[PDB]
Ligand binder design. Structure first.
Ligand code: ACO
Ligand code: OAA
Ligand code: OAA
Ligand code: OAA
Ligand code: OAA
Ligand code: OAA
Lengths: 279, 279, 1028, 279
């Protein structure tokens, strides 16, 4: 009979090249370990949900203001009503009798470039503007020259003495608690200009979270500024939006399931079929 | 140094209990093998797309009428307009700038019990009615007694001298080509009672495909009638709907992407928010 | 808008930015007492004051200070101090104006003889810039067009110093000729490098040492700040020398820049019984002229204005300022408030009326006391419903309110109120039946208005052929043509829009003020465009003159800037002119008539449409040349277009003060070019003590109306009988037999829009999509009933907004903290587990965050991640049916089911799970009552006696502690608490917790840069059939 | 009372700007209409599943050879064994007790750029090479110069007198039935050039389907080249792969559900955790 592989490996006479290299959890052994931090060390060292996003995503002890700011970003992103595209898809999937996972999932797949992509795009735009020299008056004019809108700037109603008021809370926190905010100050000059163009072009919350998150990564400790670009270039700022808005999508699922609403069918006079006359 | 595993196995001194038991493809070796049938044997033995659904799902040579009928079922299921729930989700996800896979996927997750579930439910209902004795007049009355609608019966407009006309094509094919159709004849004695109740309660295509598919499995060769209940009990009839309607969902994605339509946002006066006054 | 600046600021900008070979002495040698600073900081920071002799002037926009003597010349400090005492901070007057004599400039006195003061003045005219010089300086410069040398220089032209020496410096002293030849060229390059409208150096002391500037008057184009805000910096436009503002006027002055809107108030007399509340900027002039014309000139109170359709609260605030101010002192003849106005183009009249009537009902007490009488006239979209509801509040609170519609004359109400009348290669055709237009900008409302006008006037094709919007790719916008839907191609560049529609000859440039210039020039590079209509307001006058020069070079007709557009009924309508189709159908603008008007303000074209509609046949063509001081086409360019046109039979001209323009009309009748009857009336006859600018005695409405009266143009005395005289001359031309009235055909009718009807409430449409967890509309996000600032102010965690968004309740502090902990322990459990495996596979095939997280979350079902809901349901069903734990374990044993939520693999007893232990500790110290946890712990105390590794999992203790939380704390009623378990709120806890770990696994696999995974063939064991 | 919107709209005094412009199905009316073609006209005019992909995706009557070729492409793409990434995800999701839709969906989301992206990439690469002049010897050298592999070329075992043998069937069909095959001949010349370098760099089926599909679109009738570049630029060739491989993924779901296989958990000695020692 051949030797058993678990018994052969035990005495260690064999290699096997293990795939699936991972570095954010150690579910074996005595107790659960997140980064190098056991779960009891997570709980008795005071660190919040933002603390375990620091441990699981960025693999670092973030300081307490950064953990509370990550918590703030997940709070403000949580829901923006059911009219928007992803929550619409969750309501349709929940209303057709599906699960929590399928309804959440069918809503989450909408989150892309047009919906929910203003976080990562508004971070990348302003970061590439700020670390390549450009003064804000040249940056606004340059995005006017090639005809692209500035992502993270523009709100449909809220202009002047009428702030977004979840931008106001995040801006107050970032002024009060962060040590240094360079890219925020550039995002507020290049917005102190764009409001003078037309008054309702304030910073979005989708732009404020992006610039303050890039500012948080490259301004606090434990990020080397060339890793702090790695997480933004990967798409860690999409993760903030998706984890934040999963809260509201599951809320929409539970709400549509609790109201006992039947299957949706879109009305025929909101379609305008333009089929070819004979193909 | 330890011995290399692939080299320890090659000359065969070791076991390893292989998981992932599979039986529908052999991608290794000389050429691709679907069931026991190489791909050249698939192509030069005349067998259609329904032939390779027979090979990949049910793992059998289905006869040519059954392969053509599977092709017919995939043809009629292909699209039913954009107003329906799943194609709505595909249009929303495609219109928010996502991929083909994410738009198709966000539409496919709607396919459940209320949308797209009439195939498997209408098959299971009529099969459990027919193999448990019950005469059609007692079956209609019995589903009246416990207050459940008969799945696969009922169409919103099409009643009498106004057939579904894709039910008509499938019914003509099943009469002309199938050897024996017991459960179809029971499903038509039940539609010929229920149309006499109210005339627009004809067989759906969602009920005709289910009863003719159960009839195809347990009536043609190579199915033993505990295998032929196994595939219906698993949900192979959901697979017919999902593979059929993936065609129309990808068509809706390509159509919405070709028309260059911007991000959707549902209008606020089609919502009627009923939030609590103070929580 | 040419706004004057103080001579300190003009001196400062001159000393900063001048570029000449001359040495400008006394550079930054100026101080400014600002009769209210101290007398020591100014004498130390500018320590040159003790070094020379001095001079003091007032820099408060005072004109001709050398005649009446507000100047203090050639003294020392204390003589000047004494002067400043009987000056620095009390009343003084010049001409007519009286006021506090505030700001004084102080200059070091230059020793000058009378042979060295010179005179230079550069002012902007329409055809260029005029530089003007006189070498016999001082105040006695004499006449300015005869002896003082003028020199026009064109626009986008360079003034050569050879030109200054040869044309302008002829009678200069020969010793001081080349220093001035440098100075004038440097001063002109300063002049047009900044955007000055008017610069005045009088006098100009040029000695052997160099050049000394002493007094300047500068008016700068204040709308050009977007070019020169870095160059002016902190520019200050002082108000002209007058009285002090009231404590209501400053309230409206900072109510001005509160929303984008025009809110103006200037009081003529605060004891005046006649008060105006008039919408529309031209109507505030016309109403004031009609009141002043009818004996109310000393009893008119102000010249109020509201425009831009401000908010209900904002119009409430302006209305409370205007109604409060007339209750200060009464008058035995009674007091009148006049809610005037022209037709509003698109604004719902009813809502602004709701604001005004809420203000009236808010101040109803003193209004009944003081005997105010309100005369109201308004028109527009839904003007009727507003008029009825304001008659309703006039019946409610007892104040006499007389409401009037579009049928009555707009200024008939002020004669009814006083009681004088009783109370009851440029082309001669621009638009045709077949002209297409290209709209520059995403202006779907204006384009839809144009298509609606084209459908109602029985026109065969839409006149919007394409749209150009440079901020998005080419697509098709979906518009309405009648009741069916058509597609209008939206382009990105201009060139492809011109190539794909080569027969377009009209462009409507809806660009903003700072990008209208280059967009219009880029348009003018294409020669198929014959007319451009510039809608933007606030384009600087230098760019407007450059556009005018290239239009006269290329033969293109510019209508604008600051216009609403023009309308040719039956043919074409430029954007927003006329209003929506209520005003088009009401003024009968779907068919052509025989009367053509030219108006200057865009807001008065609607009232001219009314007067022509109700008195005569109808409008044939009406263009608004715009509000700018340099219109692209003047009056004289359009009356010649109409006189050449055979379709018209009479021409109406509505002029204002400013620009010698109606004297060209006088010359046109004088030499007989204009033979068709012209009725004209220049509004702005408020002389009883851009637009309006550089006015002489001949530039006033009285002198202009006198000149056109004597020249043969029919002129009415006031605006009231403009309708009467236009009907009189219409009867003249139908009695003579040249005007024939064609028969009225009914027009094609359009459906009313859904938004309009829905907003004006006549249609109810059943709304699907009931929701209760977010209110995105309104001012603030509302989660359950909480605004988002109430969420952050109360410091309620992520568990708090899970309570708000999922359960719609305020959970207590321990429950929010517990939900945070049970998300935290659920966060990730390694990559070997099934869902994290799927996320690693999908992330490792190069997918996004959403696709990888999604492909992992879809594993979360009944076997993986289903222990939460199933363990909570099983223990809830065991506890609620009153089964003791010893019987519950056996009843699971007899049914052949494992107790879900109990059983761990390695860690058992005195080796616990250690995150079960944390949650169990928290639930013991913080929960008020724990029945279900106690039941689950006794079931654990049995099944660990069975086998020691059968403890409560975290997947079972989160379930029983969550059901324990739901049915054991407050705010849940045990039929809501059981419902949320059956819906699957415990699946949501697991999915939201594990999403953190799955996104972490995605980021970890993406950051390690690991490539595509193919599962090894040695781990498969294919069991294919033999030969199917 | 206000007027009812359906009654208001009916007699037509009102507009409402209908969103959701669509052009591939007309589920209202007498009978189902795919492009301009009713469903009876689909069935009695002989046209296959490839015919209704022609109607639903490209909105045209494709000729019978093109419909049969689309059917061929869906046949060969159907499965390539369970070891590959997407079928692996379907087996994991099916083995954890999920639905057909969730298992299919969790497998389909793998289909991206590294798995299943060789179709669209191999089409775009060769099309941009062929319509920009470049001779094949310069094209191979140019993709050597900038260090990119040629997508759709390279097979792990099958080299010379050992063809892919589903490439052979498609190549035989394209030679026999297509009218003109320019881009295939350029892909064939290039294939030959690459093979002479190292013999196992033949055309993949993932490259042959891409070049023959671009050839089919721009070579048969009813496609103007600009609008035939539209469908390739959108990603219609991803749709062929996804609709083809959905067959095998549903087969893998039904197979894993029929074998009654329990929950999968990856072995711990195939992971190699590299967690930080203390974070
Ligand atoms: C009573 C009566 O009606 S009669 C009085 C008649 N008088 C008039 O004509 C006044 C009419 N005025 C107007 O209506 C306006 O000036 C209009 C119609 C020209 C529209 O102008 P606006 O609305 O300011 O232009 P727009 O909407 O394009 O916004 C302007 C700027 O926003 C900028 N912008 C917008 N969004 C963004 C963004 N997201 N990021 C960056 N920049 C942005 C645009 O780029 C544009 O900048 P630019 O000025 O460099 O082009
Ligand atoms: O997050 C986004 O980009 C979209 C959204 O919710 C909003 O409309 O504010
Ligand atoms: O065919 C289906 O099952 C879905 C559908 O069209 C309908 O609900 O009308
Ligand atoms: O849009 C316009 O030009 C007119 C308008 O809305 C208003 O009167 O407020
Ligand atoms: O919650 C589950 O069912 C799966 C899990 O985390 C475990 O492996 O313990
Ligand atoms: O298509 C792919 O990229 C993967 C594939 O079929 C295989 O290698 O088995």
């Amino acid at each position: 009979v051949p030797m058993d592989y678990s018994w052969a490996r035990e005495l260690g006479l064999i290699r096997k090249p293990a795939s699936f290299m991972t570095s954010i959890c150690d579910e074996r052994g005595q107790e659960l370990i997140y980064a190098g931090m056991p779960i009891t060390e997570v709980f008795k060292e005071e660190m919040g949900i933002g603390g375990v996003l620091g441990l699981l995503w960025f693999q670092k002890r973030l300081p307490k203001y950064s953990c509370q700011f990550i918590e703030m970003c997940l709070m403000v992103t949580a829901d923006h009503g059911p009219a928007v595209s992803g929550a619409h898809n969750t309501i349709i999937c929940a209303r057709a009798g599906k699960d929590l996972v399928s309804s959440l999932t069918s809503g989450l797949l909408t989150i892309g470039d047009r919906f929910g992509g203003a976080l990562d795009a508004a971070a990348k735009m302003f970061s590439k503007a700020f670390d390549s020299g450009i003064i804000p008056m040249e940056f606004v004019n340059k995005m006017k020259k090639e005809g692209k809108l500035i992502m993270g700037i523009g709100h449909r109603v809220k202009s002047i003495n009428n702030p977004d008021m979840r931008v106001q809370i995040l801006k107050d926190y970032v002024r009060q608690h962060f040590p240094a905010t360079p890219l925020l100050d550039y995002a507020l000059e290049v917005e102190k200009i764009t409001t003078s163009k037309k008054p309702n072009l304030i910073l979005n919350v989708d732009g404020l979270i992006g610039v303050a998150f890039v500012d948080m990564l490259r301004n606090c400790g434990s990020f080397t500024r060339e890793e702090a670009d790695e997480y933004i270039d990967i798409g860690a700022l999409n993760g903030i939006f998706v984890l934040g808005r999963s809260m509201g999508f599951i809320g929409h699922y539970l709400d549509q399931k609790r109201l006992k609403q039947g299957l949706y069918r879109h009305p025929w006079d909101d379609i305008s079929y333009v089929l070819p006359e004979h193909m």
